[PDB]
Amino acid sequence: SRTSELAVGIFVIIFGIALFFLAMKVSGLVGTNLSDGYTMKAQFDNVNGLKPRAKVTMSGVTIGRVDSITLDPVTRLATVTFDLDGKLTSFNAEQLKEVQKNALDELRYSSDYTQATPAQQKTMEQQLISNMNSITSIDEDAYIMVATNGLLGEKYLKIVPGGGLNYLKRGDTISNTQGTMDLEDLISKFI
Amino acid sequence: SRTSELAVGIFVIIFGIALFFLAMKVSGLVGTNLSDGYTMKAQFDNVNGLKPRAKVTMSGVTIGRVDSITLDPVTRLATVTFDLDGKLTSFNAEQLKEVQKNALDELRYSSDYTQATPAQQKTMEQQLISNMNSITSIDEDAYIMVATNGLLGEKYLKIVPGGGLNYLKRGDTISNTQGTMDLEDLISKFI
Amino acid sequence: VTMSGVTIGRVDSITLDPVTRLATVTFDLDGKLTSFNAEQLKEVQKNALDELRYSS
Amino acid sequence: TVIFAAIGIVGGKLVGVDFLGVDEGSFWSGMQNNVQFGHDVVNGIIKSIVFA
Amino acid sequence: MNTIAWLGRLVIERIRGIGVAALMLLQIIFSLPSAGGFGRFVYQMHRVGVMSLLIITVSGLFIGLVLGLQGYSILVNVGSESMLGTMVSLTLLRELAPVVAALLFAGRAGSALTAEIGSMKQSEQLASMEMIGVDPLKQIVSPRLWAGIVSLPMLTVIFAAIGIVGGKLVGVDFLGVDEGSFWSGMQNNVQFGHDVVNGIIKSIVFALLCTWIAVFQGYACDPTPEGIATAMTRTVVYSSLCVLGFDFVLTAVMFG
């Protein structure tokens, strides 16, 4: 009774090892729940070859997982919602307040003082509230894209931040996209 | 001959133990710590596809692997930290009297001694110190980048030296980086 | 390791010199078909010493 | 079947990487790209509950 | 230290047990056959071979439908499925049809011989046959051994032929690949003497082990109605370990 129930205990231990080895060592487990985990969206025309559970790559590191794609026939362009992170895409520090002091440094500077509101107080205090609620490091004008993995791998989403200076909230639509690019389309862009 | 029923019960269990460690050595759950390993860092922008336990090559030879990848969302860049191996990248006492000397014979050179020659004594006594100190075989002229080796993917890091009279230190910042240049750029330039 | 596309040898060890920054290969070659054995001296002695007694 | 699949990959890593001489890092990094968890490891378990 | 002492006593009896089964094989094959020995071999080819024909032909089809359905799902991403007819007929001919058709022969016709010779040992038919003067190794055991070495390599060919024809059904006629590039992909890459003959020599070494084990376990039983049934699982386990064990040794030699 003692050595029988023992040898079932050392049978569960070995199954626990070879379940962990399958997960973390040949499949990876980055999950559909990162820190917190909100959900933004975008709208493409050409999402071709994109199954559920893709990668969402920020600048070289996986930060999320694509949920599902749905095509509204009222406008014919495919939309997709995806989850992100908030410790990699936005501040949780006085960083949130650090970015206010450069935004009023270049825009309402000594040149463009009397080009916008030159005695702005509440418009300057609009900077104190618009930067603080649900802000991201992502600019207002990025461009998102379906990129391939290496040479002929799978397909995911990759965001390219850059240019301008305004920052967008959590749960919104990135209005700057471009779809995938198969062989046909390539020959097209060429000729 | 009673022990013959006990000499075989010992060489069965032990041979069943030695087939468990060799399944925990060639699997990557026990072992493969690196001798005199030291983990340096650099900041990249595109490290897509770059897994943990990747490859790091200096000239053609693998020296270490990759473990850690950071995303710094205050200024959005990547940050990588990876272990090298001290047996091929660090000097010993026979070379230490040489690697103190090989810059020292170029410390007293036509170029670097005739360099406000009253500071030949300043470029001699203050150098050797830190020198013989903690210093690997990597120059300051070396840049690190991501490469791939082949038309299908591996995604490894590459360190391209440049020579010099100055060397880096254990666990430091390799301050010449470069990310990858695939998909977009590639196709675009290749029309 | 190939001479014209024929496998003659295998590589055994790749080391890296820290000081000079030059890599190091160390291969083994089969000798049945790249060496001049006792028969095949007769082909090279009248050829490798024929370049020695040249006009140059 | 999990102990069968874990020992089979580790055994395949022994003759592939350590005896025939392929790269160890491209062995493992070729797995995490193409082998999902919920589509492959879970569907290999539901296939064995109907078999059991 | 009794468990270590019991474990060492277990593998010493299993080592001695090999030496009895080796001396039993040298007594069967080193003898000119008795008068009437061919009439019993034709009958024992019916029990071992012909009764096993239904399971092998049906199960050989089900692997072919899987190999055509899995090989198409992988070869459509790389877009090269003129090699579909190659990898189906290369997985079967050198690897699966020698191995799987020995894992089904150990079950159906392997363990049935151990019940057949085993029930003759508990009901004293073997002891009664010897007092008449007839030697039971030459009379009973030896037509069963030679009907096992012949009937398995005739069954891996029927396994391999039905597996390719089944793989042609789901590949060409259901998923829609070209029929002419299916067959012409075979004759380029699949030789005869390197692939079909080396798939037959691999099954003769397998047919010797799944029959010499399955005969020895039913001859050296302990005569007991629940000692027979414990020797029918000893002969399915030991056959499936020697099939997969001599697989790697024969693969490394033939395709190394």
TrEMBL record, chain C:
Could you say which residues form the signal peptide?
none
Protein name, entry field: ABC transporter periplasmic substrate-binding protein
Q: List the taxonomic lineage.
A: Bacteria, Pseudomonadati, Pseudomonadota, Gammaproteobacteria, Moraxellales
Question: Gene name?
Answer: mlaD
Automatic annotation (TrEMBL), chain E:
| Bilayer disposition of the protein | Multi-pass membrane protein
Which keywords accompany this UniProt record?
Cell inner membrane, Cell membrane, Membrane, Transmembrane, Transmembrane helix, Transport
Q: Where are the transmembrane segments?
A: 20-43, 50-76, 145-165, 196-215, 236-255
Q: Which PANTHER family match?
A: ABC TRANSPORTER PERMEASE PROTEIN-RELATED, PROTEIN TRIGALACTOSYLDIACYLGLYCEROL 1, CHLOROPLASTIC
| Family in the record | Belongs to the MlaE permease family.
Role played: Part of the ABC transporter complex MlaFEDB, which is involved in a phospholipid transport pathway that maintains lipid asymmetry in the outer membrane by retrograde trafficking of phospholipids from the outer membrane to the inner membrane. Probably responsible for the translocation of the substrate across the membrane.
The name on file for this protein is Intermembrane phospholipid transport system permease protein MlaE
Organismal lineage: Bacteria, Pseudomonadati, Pseudomonadota, Gammaproteobacteria, Moraxellales
